[PDB]
Amino acid sequence: DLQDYKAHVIAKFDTSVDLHYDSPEMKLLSDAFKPYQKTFQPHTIILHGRPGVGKSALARSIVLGWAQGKLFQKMSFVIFFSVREIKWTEKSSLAQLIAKECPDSWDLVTKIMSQPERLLFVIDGLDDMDSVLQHDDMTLSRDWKDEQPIYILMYSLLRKALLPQSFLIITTRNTGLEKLKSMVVSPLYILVEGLSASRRSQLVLENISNESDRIQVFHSLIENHQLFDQCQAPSVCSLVCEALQLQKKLGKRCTLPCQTLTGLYATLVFHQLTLKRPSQSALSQEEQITLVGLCMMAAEGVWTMRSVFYDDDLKNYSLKESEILALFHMNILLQVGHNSEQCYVFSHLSLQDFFAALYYVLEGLEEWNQHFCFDTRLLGMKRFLFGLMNKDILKTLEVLFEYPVIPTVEQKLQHWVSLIAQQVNGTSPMDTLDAFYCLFESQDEEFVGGALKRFQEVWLLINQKMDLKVSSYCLKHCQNLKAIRVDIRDLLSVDNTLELCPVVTVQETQCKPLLMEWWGNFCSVLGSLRNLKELDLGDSILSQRAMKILCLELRNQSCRIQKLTFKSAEVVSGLKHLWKLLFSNQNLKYLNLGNTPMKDDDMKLACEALKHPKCSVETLRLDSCELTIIGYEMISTLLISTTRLKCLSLAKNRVGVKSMISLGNALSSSMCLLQKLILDNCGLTPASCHLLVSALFSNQNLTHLCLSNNSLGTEGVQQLCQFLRNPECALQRLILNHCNIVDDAYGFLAMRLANNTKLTHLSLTMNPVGDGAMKLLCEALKEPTCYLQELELVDCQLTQNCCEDLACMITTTKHLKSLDLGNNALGDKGVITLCEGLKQSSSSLRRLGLGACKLTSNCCEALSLAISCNPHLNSLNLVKNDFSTSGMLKLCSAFQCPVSNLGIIGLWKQEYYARVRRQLEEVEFVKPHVVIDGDWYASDEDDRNWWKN
Amino acid sequence: SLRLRTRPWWFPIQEVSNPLVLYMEAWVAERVIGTDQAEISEIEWMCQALLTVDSVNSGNLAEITIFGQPSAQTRMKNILLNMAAWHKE
Amino acid sequence: DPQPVWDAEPQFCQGFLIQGLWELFMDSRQKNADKFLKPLSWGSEVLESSCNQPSTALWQLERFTVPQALQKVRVLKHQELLLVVAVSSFTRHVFTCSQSGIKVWNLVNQVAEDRDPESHLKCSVQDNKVYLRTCLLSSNSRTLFAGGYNLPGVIVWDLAAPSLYEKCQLPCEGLSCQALANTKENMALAGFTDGTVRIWDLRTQEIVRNLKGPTNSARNLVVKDDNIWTGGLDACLRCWDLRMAKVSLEHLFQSQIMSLAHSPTEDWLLLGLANGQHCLFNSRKRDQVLTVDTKDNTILGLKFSPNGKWWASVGMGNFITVHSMPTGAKLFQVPEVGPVRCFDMTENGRLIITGSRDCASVYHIKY
């Protein structure tokens, strides 16, 4: 009887003559059921692809080939199923389904007796059952002939737990694979594509309007990856071509744009709606109810993951197919199914998403509810909802519905887009880019302008041309931004690339790639803003041409940039053009040029340009550059001449003796006007530093000086004290972060600081001092004739013995305001005896750093009482210490007193229990200015980090 | 209008929704890419990128598609460009 | 007494917008600044800004850094007690294990709380009743080892093929896994309950050599270029030489050892005892041991950094602490719910997994 079944199965499926053949893409599937490795032989093959590609055709052709031959010969039997055409609630058995599929019933008894060794199933659909799964617990069925609703049998047959050692082939959707991958056991995955890329390009090319703007519209259509992805299926490509042709015909009558999917879909649907009406007028009430019911049904179907729409769903919303056919005349809501029950599925998923989006606009126009009787999957609906806020679609909707349309959700969308911009620690570029895409979908000036008004800072990654276009479009409406950062890693890495995609060129004459055009447009948009003053190149790698274009377009008369940064970019080719720009735009006064090697000619050109009277830069950095002795000679020659520089840095580069003497000779003359000088991480010997201080002895212009990470002897510090003692020195801040100064040098420093003004800041980090020299320092600064304000002792070998001296110093002093104690073994007794004199508050200190001082929970009471009544204290730090629960509660209760005026508090709040978290939340609630952050050193009231940038 | 290709288990499904397409000469494409599959599969594992070569175009142009995250795509493309440039000379 | 209280952590922007849209639809058919965490982009990085420092590091001190705090980004929902974890950040995967199976997840998905694995490998149905204890992952991310209580061997899975399937068996009839190891010369190691450490050949599956010691003496195993360091409840540490095949050194400690680790760069060995006392022993000089820390809870895990400048510790005491290698000073903490039993760290030192009862929380390292 097998031949009768063969004849019946070839008779029933016959719908493709030239679509099924011995294609090379089918031999791969035929050989797929073979052991790739000698150990492994696959048992389950799962096919996936885009929703619109012809996969059911593949399954049908497989069955037909088995029935005819030359496709599967060892396979003695195949069975085809279709679950989208059968209800999945009634109780049945595998025998009942097999009898429904197989006309004869006497064969299965002999079939199951010995065939399960070779028995193949072909299954279609299975993606719409992602909603019935209760996820709680389901009983596995081990044998057939069981009365049980069919979804459990699908689960059981899927586990290879019902009819084992039997091969299966499954067809599904990309987005329906979320729950299926943990069901099957060791599958083999095969991916299916639509048409090629060149064919898509030619098909889209043939359907453009060509009204003198064909290039831009074509490229906007094709480079958009989201649209081009779903243009894989032939149906969607045909729809897009039809919509473009329709726009071409009635060209002057359509004000809707043709650059996005929403415009084309609205064009088609609304033109079909207006065709039925003999004259331009308003839809009748029943037509309105039908439209509302259909849209809201689509919305619920999208929400609940259902795409079958049984007849009872049609009844529950008072809808019928005849009305839809009469009203639309378009292939919408097709009917499928061969049994008594019918199934209603849309012609695509895109249409369902579009109608789901269209629901939200029409919700509040009236009260429709009277006449009704009742994250990846939502990308299309969200994009369509964003795109439907265009004003022309709203105007047409108003004309149709004879009522003004003011959708509520517009405020919610604006609020969400604004919430991204105001972030406490900067903006995540992923959300910014996603918002830029969504706002480019809605081509409305008012909406975009109202959305982007509180950004003030932008960070972007650009690696696709469409990204350049959307950023260039949306940046024009940002009028509050002040700083930007672009990370172009690889798009412009290669200098030259000339190739054509189609067989012939798209345009007759281009002569210059599109990518260069879009880069130029983005750079000009950057250059034409008003409130932007800082430009940062981020982490990009640029060629010669990109740098040339940026330089040329930044020569404009409207750019107001003051800071230019190149600290992580390879721009070695375009330094000539940078030097040319340097003396043509006068609004910039800060140039950061770190980590870029410089030859002799580049330095000569830079020095020549820097001397030009048109130039106006006041800060310059050249750290980590590879310089020569001739470079140092040119630096000296520039330095002596008439220039406008006030800050110069030469960090992280070894300096020779000849360079040292040349620089000292140049700096010694009174005609050199410099305020600040930074020289850390360079290779200075004690002799070289001695000559440096000898040269500095006669100068009276510098105010700031840095010599960190250097080797300083006792002769050097003695010479420094000699220079800084005598009057007209005008030095305010001293930086000695890592030079090893020890023993007699601190005595000299204390003697100098005992009676000395015009000195304000002094730091002695990472230096070997005990209690003995700190005694001298505290005694010296105890005197009234010292005007230091800030002392930094982050990494000194400081112990708990001198805490009494610290307390007396605090209570007696009258001038200094800041005190840092970073990595000293303070202990608990030292801190409590320090806060004993700190609580009395005879001084006006405002900043106290107590991080990493080995504080236990025994010193909490004294700290709480000291911070309880001391209105002068403003800042504090308590990181890298441990605390028990009770001590933390006492501290928090102290935070809540009405007398305290703490403005910045340095804590990590994510390392305590729940109760401490709640108390800290209440502290934030009562006082609206307290900032509890761990990045204590990021707060810069006065310019303290001036040498680190 | 149908193409079939295998997808290994370790390649996520989220990163297959943005190919990269590059065009270059067919004669060099056939010689550079090769015929066997073991070396190609090892290259795909090393760069964490999957590539397919198509020569259905009537002209001397062949279509190459690369899948992966942007860094992997850039590295894999650089490897292919360097190999092709060396082979051409 | 104190109880940690959990809350929905991520609430990223897209989730907020989706919740807002969902609320409106339910609202209509009824008649009848906020804090967001940055996304974990591409499963690799976070794209944030580094913290500020009081001073500037040396020219040669560039790649030596120390973390500052940990931030939660996701939760992985198993159902059974978590025992071991792996990462292998080369392929952006996560392997979690329990007493009944291995569930493979992925990190590319952007989900606030995950419940769908990429697969579900179990071995209980093969025999009457078999459990799983440990797992291991090779350096190049091309092989996965696993062992059990009643298993007829240690299974070998292959992860470089177009499919995921069993490859070998490595016979062992009546011995519990209790430990695992691998070597760069294409050989495998294992240490059973009663103290036998047996070496098999990976490419042929032949037993090469057998090493025998007292009971419970192979609970932990760490290998070097030519040495093997073992120690267990016996409160001793001994070294075996593969070439010479007998004991070379032995040391006695006060309490039962619970974990071991080795520094990638220097020659220090980390030991975690049963009273919380960390220790360090020099592998090359082999002179003495020095105690650095003291805690009130037992210790159940150690691990070095890729650069060997800090280490982390997990245990029974509700806390996950991080210490600095130079001397052993405490840096910070993060509380949890119950006795933490496992964790692992990626190759690049960017993430850290942790599993307490049935949740495999993933944190992020803030440099």
**At C298, which CATH number?**
2.130.10.10
What does the block give as tokens for A345? 């599925």
Alpha helices in A2-79 (DSSP H): 2-12, 24-32, 55-68
Residue A188 sits at the vertex; the CA angle it makes with A183 and A190, to the nearest 5 degrees, is 115
CB pairs under 8 A between A and C: 150
Rounded to the nearest 10 degrees, how much is the dihedral formed by the CA atoms of A738, A739, A741, A747?
Answer: -90
List the chains bordering chain C where 3 or more Cβ pairs fall under 8 Å. Answer: A, B
Cβ within 8 Å, pair A503-B18:
no
- Asked if residue A367 and residue A424 are part of one domain, the reply reads no
Q: Which chain A residue has its CA at the smallest distance from C36's CA?
A: A423
DSSP letters for A233-271: SHHHHHHHHHHHHHHHHTGGG--S-SSSHHHHHHHHHHH
Whole-number CA gyration radius for chain C: 22
| Test the C interface: residue of A28, A33, A37 with most C CBs within 10 Å | A37
Are both A324 and A438 inside the same structural domain?
no
CB atoms within 10 A of CB A445: 10
Instruction: Let me know if residue C319 belongs to a domain.
Output: yes
Q: Which of A24, A43, A40, A47 is nearest to A189 (CA)?
A: A47
Expressed as residue numbers, the domain containing C260 is 253-367
A501 in B contact zone (CB under 8 Å): yes
Phi, psi of A878 (to 5 degrees): -145, 35
Number of Cβ within a 10 Å radius of residue A854: 17
Give rounded-to-5 percent helix, strand, coil for chain A.
45, 10, 45
Helix (H, G, I), strand (E, B) or coil at B3: strand
**Phi, psi torsion values for B67, nearest 5 degrees:** -120, 145
Residue C85 lies in a domain: no
C2 vs C335: CA distance, rounded Å:
11
C297 and C314 in contact (C-beta within 8 Å)? Answer: no
Token code pair at residue C61: 């001190």
Does the distance separating the beta carbons of C55 and A738 come in below 8 Å?
Answer: yes
Q: Under DSSP, is residue C202 helix (H, G, I), strand (E, B) or coil?
A: coil
A291 and A412 in a common domain: no
* Cβ atoms A912, A888 nearer than 8 A: yes
Same domain for A187 and A315, yes or no, is no
**String of b and e for A302-333 (b: at least 16 CB within 10 Å)?**
bbebbbbbbeeebeebebeeebbeebbebebb
User: Same domain for A131 and A28?
Assistant: yes
Residue A248 lies in a domain: no
Distances (CA, A) of A228 to A197, A256, A501, A781, C268: 9, 20, 16, 73, 57
Q: What is the spatial distance between Cα C283 and Cα B34, in angstroms, rounded to a whole number?
A: 50
Q: Give me A576's structure tokens.
A: 């000539």
Residue C5 lies in a domain: no
Cβ separation of B4 and A194 shorter than 8 Å?
no
Residues 6+ positions from C13 with CB-CB distance below 8 Å? A416, A419, A420, A431, C36
Quick one: tokens of C71?
Answer: 């931030």
| In a domain? residue C133 | no
Residue A393: burial class (beta carbons within 10 Å; 0-12, 13-18, 19+): buried
Spatial contact of A704 and A675, defined as CB atoms under 8 Å apart? yes
Residue B65 sits at the chain C interface (C-beta within 8 Å): no
Cβ contact A191–B16 (<8 Å): yes
Question: CB-based contact (8 Å) between B85 and chain A?
Answer: no
Indicate the helix (H) or strand (E) that contains A629.
helix A629-640
Whether the CB of B59 is below 8 Å from some CB of chain C: the reply is no
Residue from C42, C164, C348 whose CB has the most chain B CBs within 10 Å, to mutate: C42
Q: Is A249 annotated as a binding residue?
A: no
**A231/B contact by beta carbon, under 8 A:** no
CATH number at residue A106: 3.40.50
Q: Which residue has the tokens 């830079």?
A: A606
Distance CA A171, CA A157 (A): 15
C-chain CB neighbours of A426 within 8 Å are 48-49
Which residues of chain C neighbour A422 with C-beta distances below 8 Å? 33
Contact at CB, A738 and C5, closer than 8 angstroms: no
Q: How far apart are the first and last CA of chain C?
A: 33
Non-local (6+) Cβ contacts of C255 within 8 A are: C235, C273, C274, C275, C277
User: Tokens for A380?
Assistant: 């299309």
All structural domains of chain B, each given as residue ranges with its CATH number in brackets, are 17-88 (3.30.1370.10)
**Do A414 and A534 fall into the same domain?**
yes
According to DSSP, residue A442 is labeled S
Is A50 labeled as ligand-binding?
A: yes
Residues of chain B contacting residue C106, judged by C-beta atoms under 8 Å apart: 12
Nearest to C89 by CA among B48, B73, B19: B48
Query: C-alpha angle A468/B80/B22, rounded to 5°?
Result: 45
In angstroms, the CA A258 to CA B55 distance is: 33
> Which amino acid is it at A16?
S
Measure the CA–CA gap between A623 and A566, rounded to whole angstroms: 12
| Token pair in block for residue A935 | 């990045």
Grouping H, G, I as helix, E, B as strand and the rest as coil, residue A124 is: strand
Q: Which residue of C has its CA nearest to B71?
A: C42
Tell me whether residue C29 is in a domain.
no
| Residue A69 counted as an annotated binding residue | no
Q: Are residues A876 and A899 in the same domain?
A: yes
Non-local CB neighbours of A162 within 8 Å, separated by 6+ positions: A94, A141, A142, A143, A144, A153, A156
Burial of A815 (0-12, 13-18, 19+ CB in 10 A): middle
A432 CB-near residues (< 8 Å, 6+ apart): A420, A458, A459, A460
Contact A44, A170 (CB under 8 A): yes
How would DSSP label each residue in A487-505?
E--STT-SS-----SSSS-
User: What are the tokens at A848?
Assistant: 């106290």
- For this entry, resolution in Å reads 3.4
* Packed helices A803-812 and A771-781: angle between N→C axes, nearest 10 degrees: 10
Q: What torsion, rounded to 10 degrees, do the Cα atoms C76, C78, C84, C90 define?
A: -40
Q: Nearest residue on chain B to A196, judged by CA atoms?
A: B1
Closest CA to A168 of A186, A151, A152, A150: A186
Task: Confirm or deny that A52 is annotated as ligand binding.
Answer: yes
Do A179 and A308 have their domain in common?
no
**Does residue A934 fall inside a structural domain?**
yes
Question: From the CA of A170, how many Å to the nearest CA of chain B?
Answer: 15
A195 at B interface, C-beta within 8 A: yes
Place of tokens 């007998």: C246
Q: How many domains does chain C have?
A: 1
User: What sign for the dihedral angle of Cα A674, A675, A676, A677?
Assistant: positive
CATH of the domain at A892: 3.80.10.10
Residue located via tokens 């700031």: A704
**C304, C262 Cβ separation under 8 angstroms:** yes
Pairwise CA distance, residues C73 & C22, whole Å: 23
> Which positions ≥6 away from A113 have C-beta within 8 Å?
none
Determine the Cα angle at B65 with ends B63 and B66, to 5°: 150
Name the pairing type of β-strands A647-649 and A619-621: parallel
Determine the angle formed by the axes of helices A885-895 and A914-926, rounding to 10 degrees.
10
- For residue C75, list its beta bridge partners: C361
CB contact at 8 A, A291 and A324? no
Q: Is B10 on the interface with C (CB under 8 A)?
A: yes
As a 3-state breakdown, chain B gives helix, strand, coil percent values, each rounded to 5, of 45, 25, 30
Taking the C-alpha atoms of residue A927 and residue A898, their distance in angstroms, rounded to an integer, is 9
- One-letter amino acid identity for B13? I
Token pair for A544: 């010669």
**Range 26-45 of A in CB contact (< 8 A) with B:** 26, 28-29
Give me the phi and psi of A506, to 5 degrees please. Answer: -65, -45
Burial class from Cβ neighbours inside 10 Å (0-12, 13-18, 19+) for residue A386 reads buried
Q: Which residues make beta-bridge pairs with B62?
A: B24
Contact between B8 and C161 using a beta-carbon 8 Å cutoff: yes
C170 Cβ contact partners less than 8 Å away, ≥ 6 residues apart = C153, C154, C155, C156, C188, C190, C200, C205
Instruction: Give, in order, the Cα–Cα distances in Å from A588 to each of A552, A562, A697.
Output: 15, 4, 33
Q: At C15, which helix (H) or strand (E)?
A: helix C13-28
Q: Are strands A704-706 and A733-735 parallel, antiparallel or unpaired?
A: parallel
CA atoms within 13 A on the CB side of C185: 9
- Structure tokens belonging to residue B5: 């290709």
Q: A255 with A375: CB under 8 angstroms? A: no
**Residue numbers in A near C328 (CB within 8 A):** none
Which of the residues A365, A485, A908, A944 would you substitute to probe the C interface, choosing the one with the greatest number of C C-beta atoms within 10 Å? Answer: A908
Token representation of residue B20: 């990269």
Q: Does residue C347 lie in a domain region?
A: yes
Q: Are strands C310-315 and C320-324 parallel, antiparallel or unpaired?
A: antiparallel
What whole-number distance in Å separates Cα of residue A385 and Cα of residue A395?
Answer: 16
Question: Which residues of A fall within a CB distance of 8 Å from C167?
Answer: 39
- Residues A469, A360, single domain; the answer is no
Are A106 and A150 spatial neighbours (Cβ–Cβ below 8 Å)? no
B37 touches chain C (CB under 8 A): no
Q: What is the CA radius of gyration of chain B?
A: 13
Phi and psi at residue A914, in whole multiples of 5°?
Answer: -75, -40
Q: Does A422 lie in the same domain as A397?
A: no
Contact flag A948-C56 (C-beta cutoff 8 Å): yes
* Token output for A921: 């939340």
CB A120 within 8 A of CB A72: yes
Let me know if residue A439 belongs to a domain: yes
Chain A partners within 8 Å of C335 (Cβ): 911-913
CATH number, domain containing residue A454: 3.80.10
Interface check for C189 against chain A (CB to CB < 8 A): the answer is no
Structure tokens given for A183: 């069901």
Residue C206 lies in a domain: no
Degrees to nearest 5, angle at CA A780 with A773 and A941: 95
DSSP state of C42: T
Task: Kindly determine whether residue A198 and residue B7, on different chains, have CB atoms separated by under 8 Å.
Answer: no
Q: Cβ–Cβ contacts within 10 Å for residue A613, how many?
A: 9
CA A57 to chain centre: 41
Nearest residue to A883 (alpha-carbon basis) of A846, A908, A918: A908
**B21–chain C nearest CA distance, Å:** 21
C-alpha to C-alpha distances, A798 to A41, A605, A793, A804, A817, nearest whole angstrom = 71, 51, 9, 13, 20
Contact C308, C345 (CB under 8 A): no
Same-domain check for residues A400 and A332: yes
> Which residues, at least 6 apart from A232, have a Cβ–Cβ distance to it below 8 Å?
A50, A52, A53, A193, A194, A195, A200
Q: Taking the alpha carbons of A21, A23, A26, A31 in that order, is the dihedral positive or negative? A: positive
**Structural domains of chain A, count:** 4
Ramachandran angles phi, psi of C45, nearest 5°: -125, 175
Distance CA A654, CA A500 (A): 50
Question: How are beta strands A591-592 and A619-621 bridged, if at all?
Answer: parallel
Residue A842: domain span: 785-949
Q: Taking a C-beta distance cutoff of 8 angstroms, is the pair A891, A858 a contact?
A: no
Give every CB contact of residue A118 below 8 A, 6+ residues apart in sequence: A74, A75, A76, A77
Using alpha carbons only, give the angle C275, C277, C281 rounded to the nearest 5 degrees: 135
Residue A402 and residue A386 share a domain:
yes
Does A408 sit within 8 Å of C24, measured CB to CB? yes
SS3 C359: strand
Residue A422 resides in a domain: yes
Asked if C91's CB is within 8 angstroms of B10's CB, the reply is yes
Burial A76-114 (b: 16+ CB within 10 A, else e): ebbebbbbbbbebeeebbbebbbeeebeeeebbeebeee
Do C29 and A369 form a contact (C-beta atoms < 8 A)?
Answer: yes
